[PDB]
Structures are given as structure tokens and as C-alpha cells.
Amino acid sequence: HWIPVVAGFLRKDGKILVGQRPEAGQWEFPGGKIENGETPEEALARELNEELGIEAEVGELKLACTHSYGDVGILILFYEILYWKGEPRAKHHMMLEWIHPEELKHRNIPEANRKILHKIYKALGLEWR
Amino acid sequence: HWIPVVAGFLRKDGKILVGQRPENNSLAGQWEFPGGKIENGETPEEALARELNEELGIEAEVGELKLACTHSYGDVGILILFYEILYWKGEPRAKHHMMLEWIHPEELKHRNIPEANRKILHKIYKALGLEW
Ligand SMILES: Nc1nc2c(ncn2[C@H]2C[C@H](O)[C@@H](COP(=O)(O)OP(=O)(O)OP(=O)(O)O)O2)c(=O)[nH]1
Ligand SMILES: Nc1nc2c(ncn2[C@H]2C[C@H](O)[C@@H](COP(=O)(O)OP(=O)(O)OP(=O)(O)O)O2)c(=O)[nH]1
């Protein structure tokens, strides 16, 4: 039993966009579940819109990973988001931040992201140091 | 309700590896890229190295992720991750598929392949370093 998730990398002068989960406390890349019928891209442009209020174009696929929370299995696809209309506003996360990507190392993020943090860094054109 | 599937591109002087689905009580006749379902617990890579071993008898290293697509059977949801397989040990033997072939990638245009593959045949060609 799987739940496919899509997530995007938006950048701003090097910094990356994470959002703070509402109802949990963790920071994460904007995105959400693929609904029945939609391509990953469609799901992501939609989630970016309803979470951020932006009209995003979905770029290259960067990474995929899996994670288990019990009998629950998530598959996350991460996509580079270069192009969008407007500026992201917090519609769903009780906070949004542009952070230095190095900060991920000491932000509370999904264990699914934590375990592949290095892969994420490369995908962002960076070095795990 | 979703089913993540992983699949590989192996290449041989330009040609690409496809296998023919077992002429059996399965969704057969169709040619497809070697691979299979992600089992519980495994990363996409683990699932694919494993599937390439059971289907082909090769020890493959899984390379860079090229493509992801989805497809519906109304109620059934298939998500397919395609990976570049550059390195492996041995030569592929027909173990699961009732036929294996190295084909000119162009031949995909007139091969019976999963609709999930045909809908994005153009994306596949690019991911293979070619032009549609
Ligand atoms: N968007 C996003 N989701 C992630 C990330 N890492 C792990 N996930 C997982 C946690 C969640 O189970 C799932 C995202 O589901 P959502 O919270 O967007 O759906 P929703 O708010 O509707 O929750 P619900 O189905 O009502 O319980 O993906 C990430 O970096 N970004
Ligand atoms: N490996 C691979 N699977 C594909 C491709 N296109 C669509 N699929 C879908 C169809 C199948 O539902 C799924 C692969 O499942 P498997 O054949 O590995 O499972 P199994 O051998 O147990 O047979 P079964 O699906 O239970 O009838 O992926 C492709 O190009 N390569």
C-alpha cells in the first residue's frame, strides 16, 4: 500500500523554500499527494498553487525515494521548479521560509528527507561537505 | 490505491533491452523494459537491482533516475520510475520474459508496449539521448 508524493525545489538567490507543517511541526518541501488521474507534474503544479498561490511550471525530475511509517509506504518524487508567476504566500503551512540549504542539516525534516539529505544536496547542485 | 514500479534502460551499441511479457495469464504479448514492483521496505534502486537479477540474471548497478509517469486502469494506479542502467555483470538471459531483444530504440514506435510507455514515448526518447 503506497502513497506517491510530489515535492518541489524552488530557489531564491541560493536559498530554498521549505514550509512548516500545520497539524507535524516538521519542515518540508512544498507539494502533496498525486490524486487519481493526474501525472506527477499536474499533481505538483496543483499542490504548489493551492499551498503557495503561485502558477508554477514543473521542471526536471531530480530524485525519488521511499519511506515506511508502519504499514504506510510513501514514495516521494522531487522536481526542480525554475519558473512560476507571483510570490509564494503561506496558504497552508503556518510558516514559509527561504533558508540556506546548509540549514537543512539542523532543521527538523521528514525522516524520508533526512535519510537522503546528501542526494538532495547534489540534486540542488551542492556538495555534502 | 497505487503501485510503484521500477524499470531500467540497458543499452548495447545504441540498441535497448526490452522483454516480452510472459505469454501467460498475465497482461501479456507486450514488450516492456526490464523491472518490476517495489516491495515494502526497499528503495527504488534495491527493487530494481533485485528485479534485474531475477528477470535477467545480471548484477546491475542502478544509475541516474530519468523519468516518472503515472497511468490509470480506472481503479488501478501505476507509477513508473525509469532508471539508466549503465553498469552490470554478465549478459542478460531470458529468465522471466518469454523473449528478450536488443532493438533499435526507433522500433518502439511500432512495438506493442504498455500504454503507460506509449503516452510518454517522446519523453523516453529524450531520456535515452535521442530525438522523437
Ligand atoms: N509535500 C511533502 N510531503 C512529504 C515530504 N516528505 C514526506 N512527505 C509525506 C508526508 C505526508 O504523508 C505526505 C504528504 O501529504 P499531505 O500532508 O500533503 O496530504 P494532506 O495534508 O491532505 O494529509 P491527509 O491525507 O489529509 O492526512 O508526504 C516532503 O518533503 N514534502
Ligand atoms: N517493468 C515494467 N513494468 C511496467 C512497464 N510498463 C508498465 N508496467 C507495469 C505493468 C505491471 O502492472 C507492473 C509490473 O509488474 P510485474 O510484471 O513485475 O509483476 P508480476 O510479475 O508479479 O505480474 P503481475 O503484475 O502480478 O500480473 O508495471 C514497463 O515498461 N516495465
B3 inside 8 A of chain A by CB: yes
Which method, experimentally, gave rise to this model? X-ray
Residues in chain B closer than 8 A to A38 (CB atoms): 70
Resolution (A): 2.6
Cell of B31: 514488450
d(CA B16, CA B57): 17
Rounded to the nearest whole angstrom, what is the distance from the C-alpha of residue B36 to the centroid of ligand 2?
Answer: 5
The minimal CB distance from A40 to the residues B42, B70, B72 is found for B70
Nearest to B51 by CA among B16, B1, B10: B10
Ligand 2 near B44 CB (within 6 A): no
Residue pair A113/A120 in contact by the 8 Å Cβ criterion: yes
Residue pair B15/B98 in contact by the 8 Å Cβ criterion: no
Three-state SS string across chain A, please? Answer: CEEEEEEEECEECCEEEEEECCCCCCEECCEEECCCCCCHHHHHHHHHHHHHCCEEECCCEEEEEEEEECCEEEEEEEEECCEEECCCCCCCCCEEEEECHHHHHHCCCCHHHHCCHHHHHHHCCCCCC
Mind telling me how many Å the CA of B94 is from chain A's nearest CA? 29
Cell of B4: 510503484
What Cα–Cα distance (Å) separates residue A21 from each residue in A32, A107, B71? 12, 13, 29
| A60-71: burial string, b at 16+ Cβ within 10 Å, e else | ebbbbbbbeeee
SS3 state at B58: coil
Beta strands B15-20 and A27-28: pairing type? unpaired
Annotated binding site of A for dGTP: 21, 29, 33, 113
Residue in the block written with cell 541560493: A14
Annotated binding site of A for GTP: 21, 29, 31, 33, 113
What domains are defined for chain A?
1-129 (3.90.79.10)
Residue in the block written with cell 511509517: A69
Nearest to B19 by CA among B50, B42, B51: B51
Continuous segment of H or E residues that includes residue B52: helix B44-56
Rounded to the nearest whole angstrom, what is the distance from the C-alpha of residue B37 to the centroid of ligand 2?
Answer: 7
